[PDB]
Symmetry: C3
Subunit: 533 residues, 3 copies
């Protein structure tokens, strides 16, 4: 007993020192492994060295910003005062310079490019103007968020699309994600057998969802997802000027689904303003989760375009939310509270994986059931429309025919050519009435037909569309904005914050419209920047 | 801002006028389409014209009955008083006339028909007498509901079965329903692949359930299901004399399942009397839902017989409930409250479809699990019974052998011939211990063997049975009365009305017996009316 | 009415007499059937006669012990006092005799057996010593439970393994269970089609779980499971000296899973001590359910070893729980309350089957989801470890390689030979990080390779291992102790007794370690008793 007591006392004495010592030993062992690998053959060992270097750089940066924050603020203070003193005369100069730059760039580049892209820019203008017309509080609007959002979208798009180094990186990331979920496809062979490929959607696509949920929960427990979310949220906050919680939500949505995103700010959901709740719902509707990314890349959709669309959507979502529905009341929630996100209550990584996996049981079931019902309804609608058409001697009438004409103007404004606008309109109709999955499937079919080659027109029917139309379509459909999505979103938001039910419902409706408009804006920018093949 | 305010004021001014104007414009466009179709080719366009005419007639009738209700009641009042004044002497005359008519019809028709059907009528008498013997409150019974229920069953059966125009209509309706769920079968190919037919029950039959649930929810939101329920309920109410809620429930059950039917009167479930709760449960047990109709018609079961059985069951269910368990306490619920049914709380048709689809997730899982367990138990029972029989030198002993002899008297009383009564008894045993699905499958096998042709007896074993036996079997098995059904029914009823738990449990037991007896009565009438092949 | 009243009065008069009369008539009919079968052909009829005889014997024994308990206690009292008076000097004599017997048996048998088994005994000693070192309350420990637990394990193992009559019985029982769940496999063909074998795990293995749950619920309603649990619990109670509830739990766990076992003492869970809760969790972790037994026997695992391991585990679980974590507080719960187990609230056998089946819906879903996620994670881990290894010119690095070396000492102490210890270590790693299902699958592969024959080493890689190693592996892996299991166990225990949350969590962690150690002890004993092939 005495020896055990002495050992316990020794353990109590060295607690912090012992933990630091063991962590340091582990890190030193990792560094030794890295250096041995570099010694033997540097060319193979390069990735590990790069990862270690970037991690060290980020840790050093974080520590310095923490400790030296006051000194940096002191250094920055004089310049802010000097800018404020001269701001009155300088604001006009800055605005004029920006306008002149816009004019020069637009003329030279896009005029050397063609008409369709000039039309894309016109569509950008039209969408923004319309949102300003039908805003909830048109008189009181802050234009800095809108302008900065559009500018940031343009800069990101320009870098990623018109530069070779930028283009290669996203391709690499897409390949990584695709392989990462391919690891999932193999793991599900055990449960459903080697004949799981017989039923593709049920035994490949949904298991991908399951694996993604588990991985995300583990990373949440470790504390990485949070880091990336905080960085991007701080960027948006320091530039767009939005409130804290909405920026945090938007950054999270980039790689998180609509249902799980509000849980980031769950504790403060009761106290949020109506505008911030609208922003949350709009961000949820305007961006897709990471789970669907691997599947969509597998279909044939470009990885670079999908990732760029997801990244660009969040700033656009916030900008459109502010313009469509601006804030009229003071925000209670503080920056420190919002940025802080409570970690999982579980006790070990494996418990977090288990809990994350169990939650997915509901989502998959609801998805499968809704798909069954809505596709059956589409079949009934097509058969009945054909029956009605036969009366007027047009037996070819179908859902696709009405939705081609109804949605054509939106496609034309986005910069798609006249011939392909109808084909894009069919996909938009599929996205709005049904999930983006069906629409992406149809798009993949058109892409595959283009790649195989053959007659553009088998008969007076066009078979495949041009590459640029496909890129614009990729941007236009990268959202969770559906009518069934509206219901589940409302239900979840009401669950988390029972007090705010009616505010949640009212936000939902306008939010979905804002999300679709935000999705259109990214497509307009992509059309402006992508060259005609 | 001023222009927006002026537009909002103009919108506020014209609200009702604008809505009426747009609805009128839409209706006029529909009528123009109809008339154009009729102009070009009337023969093709006939269905649309017929639908429009009947819809207009019903709307006019409803409006007139609403506005002119007082005047019609005033016109009707004198005749009621005149009848009441002379009722004392006239009641004996009416009863004698009815008895004489019954005797004459029975003699001529059924005597020219044969012995089996006279036995069917005898079975009708026997079942009613037995229910009167074992009633909860034998002394206090109202005979008008019982007699009127039997009479209405007889009239409906006579019209539908012995008249050619009546026979054709139900065949047409069955074909419509079969095609309607065939639309479902196609829609489920997407999720489970084109090899979904490999697993027939899992990937065809259950998806049919899903599609039916979605369609029913949409129609509920639109407000059609409610209209039909109200019409049939009013008929039963004005003739049978039952209380409001039970009539409403019975009309709904005709095409609604046992689990969803009480939700029609959910708000008033706490306050219902014991007799009305027994009536609800009996109606639930005695009738089948619309989802199973398409499958059962697909197996080979006749559409006309299935639909006629479902329609006839509800009046029989109410009559048997009253005779078996009569009311001893005053009914609180009013007609207006009961007939009114709150519409779905959802916000658009698509939300209603989503919500209806999500609910079906539980039902399908429970069905599949119960089927797995109970069929495995049947296998074990057969193997053990064979093992026991081998001891006594009868290795052929099985579940079917015991259940052939045990249930034979019921089949004989229904009018089935002696040879086929055993075969029907096996099916009845399957229905009672297991769901009607298995029993209908066996019945379909026997029907198919009859249609193929061949030896009636391969050896001293009969292979197929006569057509009339199949019709009587179709009527006898059209119910949800099983022991597993008893449990889920009790659970759901207890959930909706927690206060009434014990009353719910006591009602359940007697209710199932009443339901089975009601199912037998329809078969007796069918045997009386169907001719010997 | 009067006749009904007279009949009701007559029924009231004869209630108990009538029930006894009918039960007696049924029993007499059963006996007549037995005697007729014996008359015709005794050889065939033997099983029924044996069952009847044993049932009669047990009923007579129970009745006599009930009625004559006081007289038997009176007879036993004098001997207890005489033993107590002389106990002071006699305890040393008894202990010395036991030690001498242990020495003689060990020397003769195991010395004539070989080194490996002497090492097995050494491993037994080592595990017990280590548990004594790291006990929660080392100073206060009661050694009688530990010693008696080890002794009872040894006696059961000796009888079952070294005697031919004992060996045959468990083989027979395993065949019975395997056929019993094979009945399940047939029943599931209806739902998933005859092509259900295409997806083996989803449509065979999980349906086995469903059928087992249903059968267990039915037997619980009838009252058999309870009888067996009570008998074994009384044995453990009268010998080990443990408290009532923990003994009852341990006996139940032998054939009940970790999740359902605490429901036996659900009403008293709030008031249990910390030590008893630790014992409950340890028993849950150290034993497997009956559902998995049929599957594991199907893989190729020996029936006799599996059943013996399950039986031996519970006494070991209690002993290890006491030594690892001893009780420091008085036990409130009484023997009578604990032994009594409330029967199911349902109303008939079929309701109990339905309720038992519905509960299984959650378990199967969670199992499938966790398997998908964890196997995908294993794939990712193997690929990344191979990538890291390629840097150091060892592309063969994998999960199995690390886990072979890490767990080798445990396998060596259990008595496995040096060459096969690594192979066993891989299986132990699979069991700890993933469910025992995967590990048993790998073990079945090794057994099948041994049976087929061929090169022991294809190259410097061993392909199959010796029979004794397989037996020790069978004992070592017969547990539910996994990390995912830890989470669900904690969740369920917290649900049943919300007051005890923190005590539940603290018990869980130590409990899992205790369970694994208990699993090792049974393997050590098996190695001591099994001869070298
Ligand atoms: C998931 C794929 C295979 C699919 O075909 O289903 C699409 C529907 O699934 C919703 N969805 C998706 C992911 C998520 N979190 O990762 N939460 C959601 O709600 C989403 O809105 C859409 O409607
Ligand atoms: C549904 C078919 C494919 C089947 O084989 O299953 C039969 C069992 O399903 C119950 N059932 C059915 C429909 C319903 N609402 O539409 N509610 C229910 O409870 C019903 O009682 C019976 O036992
Ligand atoms: C069941 C087989 C096919 C399987 O591969 O799954 C293994 C996992 O299932 C857990 N399990 C099992 C039975 C039970 N009651 O009978 N309760 C449980 O928790 C158990 O712990 C293990 O982890």
């Amino acid at each position: 007993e005495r020896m055990c007591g002495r050992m316990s006392d020794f353990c109590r004495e060295h607690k912090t020192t012992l933990r630091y010592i063991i962590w340091g030993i582990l890190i030193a062992g990792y560094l030794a492994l890295v250096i041995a690998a570099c010694v033997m053959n540097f060319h193979r060992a390069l990735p590990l060295f790069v990862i270690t270097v970037v991690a060290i750089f980020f840790v050093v940066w974080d520590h310095l910003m923490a400790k030296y924050e006051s000194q940096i603020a002191r250094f920055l203070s004089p310049g802010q005062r000097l800018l404020d003193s001269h701001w009155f005369w300088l604001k006009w100069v800055i605005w004029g310079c920006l306008i002149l730059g816009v004019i020069l760039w637009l003329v030279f580049d896009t005029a050397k490019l063609g008409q369709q892209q000039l039309v894309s820019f016109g569509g950008l203008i039209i969408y923004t103007s319309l949102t300003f017309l039908f805003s909830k509080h048109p008189t009181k609007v802050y234009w800095r968020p809108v302008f900065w959002g559009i500018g940031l979208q343009f800069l990101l798009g320009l870098l990623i699309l018109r530069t070779e180094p930028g283009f290669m990186a996203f391709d690499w990331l897409g390949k990584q994600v695709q392989t990462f979920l391919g690891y999932s496809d193999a793991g599900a062979s055990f449960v459903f057998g080697e004949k799981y490929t017989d039923h593709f959607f049920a035994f490949k696509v949904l298991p991908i969802v399951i694996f993604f949920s588990t991985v995300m929960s583990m990373l949440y427990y470790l504390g990485l997802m949070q880091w990336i979310i905080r960085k991007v949220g701080w960027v948006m906050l320091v530039t767009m000027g939005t409130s804290p919680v909405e920026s945090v939500v938007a950054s999270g949505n980039i790689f998180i689904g609509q249902t799980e995103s509000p849980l980031l700010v769950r504790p403060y959901l009761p106290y949020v303003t109506k505008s911030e709740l609208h922003a949350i719902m709009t961000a949820g509707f305007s961006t897709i989760a990471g789970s669907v990314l691997g599947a969509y890349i597998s279909f044939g959709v470009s990885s670079s375009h999908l990732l760029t669309a997801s990244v660009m959507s969040a700033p656009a979502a916030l900008a459109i939310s502010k313009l469509f529905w601006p804030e009229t009341e003071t925000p209670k929630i503080n920056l420190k509270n919002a940025m802080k996100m409570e970690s999982g209550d579980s006790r070990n990584l494996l418990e977090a994986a288990t809990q994350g996996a169990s939650s997915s049981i509901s989502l998959v079931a609801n998805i499968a059931v809704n798909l069954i019902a809505f596709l059956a309804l589409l079949s009934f609608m097509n058969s009945a429309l054909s029956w009605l058409g036969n009366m007027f001697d047009y037996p070819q009438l179908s859902f696709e025919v009405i939705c081609s004409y109804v949605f054509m103007p939106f496609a034309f404004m986005m910069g798609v050519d006249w011939q392909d606008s109808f084909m894009v309109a069919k996909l938009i109709g599929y996205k709005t009435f049904f999930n983006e999955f069906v629409a992406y499937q149809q798009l993949s079919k058109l892409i595959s037909l283009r790649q195989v080659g053959g007659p553009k027109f088998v008969d007076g029917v066009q078979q495949y569309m041009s590459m640029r139309s496909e890129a614009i379509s990729t941007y236009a459909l990268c959202g969770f904005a559906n009518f069934g999505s509206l219901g589940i979103v409302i239900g979840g938001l009401t669950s988390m914050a029972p007090s705010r039910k009616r505010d949640i419902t009212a936000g939902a409706m306008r939010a979905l419209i804002a999300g679709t408009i935000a999705c259109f804006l990214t497509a307009c920018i992509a059309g402006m920047l992508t060259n005609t093949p």
